[PDB]
Amino acid sequence: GADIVLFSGSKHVEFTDWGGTDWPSAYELQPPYQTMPFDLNKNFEIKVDYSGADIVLIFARWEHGSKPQIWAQISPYYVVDGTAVFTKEQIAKAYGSDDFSDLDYIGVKPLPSADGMTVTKIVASYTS
Numbered sequence: 061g062a063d064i065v066l067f068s069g070s071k072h073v074e075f076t077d078w079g080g081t082d083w084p085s086a087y088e089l090q091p092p093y094q095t096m097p098f099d100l101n102k103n104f105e106i107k108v109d110y111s112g113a114d115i116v117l118i119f120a121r122w123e124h125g126s127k128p129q130i131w132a133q134i135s136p137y138y139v140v141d142g143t144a145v146f147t148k149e150q151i152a153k154a155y156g157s158d159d160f161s162d163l164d165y166i167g168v169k170p171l172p173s174a175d176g177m178t179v180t181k182i183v184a185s186y187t188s
């Protein structure tokens with residue numbers, strides 16, 4: 061029923077400690093530069109099947125002129141089983157608005173772990 065698959069497979073990210081402020085990702089989009097696989101203006105949820113580490117979703121805007129950098133680092137709205145769910149309403153509250161006209165970056169990233177994080181699926185779906 062109209063799920064969009066952003067990724068399916070077995071993507072492994074090693075990240076054992078904070079060390080630098082270099083921070084590897086499982087998945088990234090840059091909306092100003094890449095055609096988009098889903099429409100940010102719909103009411104959407106992003107669901108990630110993962111294991112091995114705790115997970116976050118980043119929505120970011122780089123600093124430009126007198127508008128500051130936004131780094132909306134979001135924990136899952138909830139986890140069930142092996143799946144993290146993130147919702148548009150949650151993302152918009154962390155981003156400061158639901159206006160994504162200036163969104164530079166979307167990233168799915170692990171927190172530090174000994175074994176690394178593996179993502180097997182990322183799905184966008186549109187909700188009521």
Ligand SMILES: OC[C@H]1O[C@@H](O[C@H]2[C@H](O)[C@@H](O)[C@H](O[C@H]3[C@H](O)[C@@H](O)[C@H](O[C@H]4[C@H](O)[C@@H](O)[C@H](O)O[C@@H]4CO)O[C@@H]3CO)O[C@@H]2CO)[C@H](O)[C@@H](O)[C@@H]1O
Nearest residue numbers: 078079080081082083120121122123124129130131133165
């Ligand atoms: O135009 C600028 C340029 O930006 C590039 O991206 C940078 C951001 O500019 C930079 O601020 C940033 O971010 C993370 C940092 O990497 C994380 O380490 C941090 O995380 C916390 C963590 O949540 C704590 O629990 C833990 O204890 O410590 C760490 C702190 O070390 O939060 C900051 C928020 O900024 O990293 C980005 C990497 O890209 C773009 O790449 C470039 O294109 C833009 O032009």
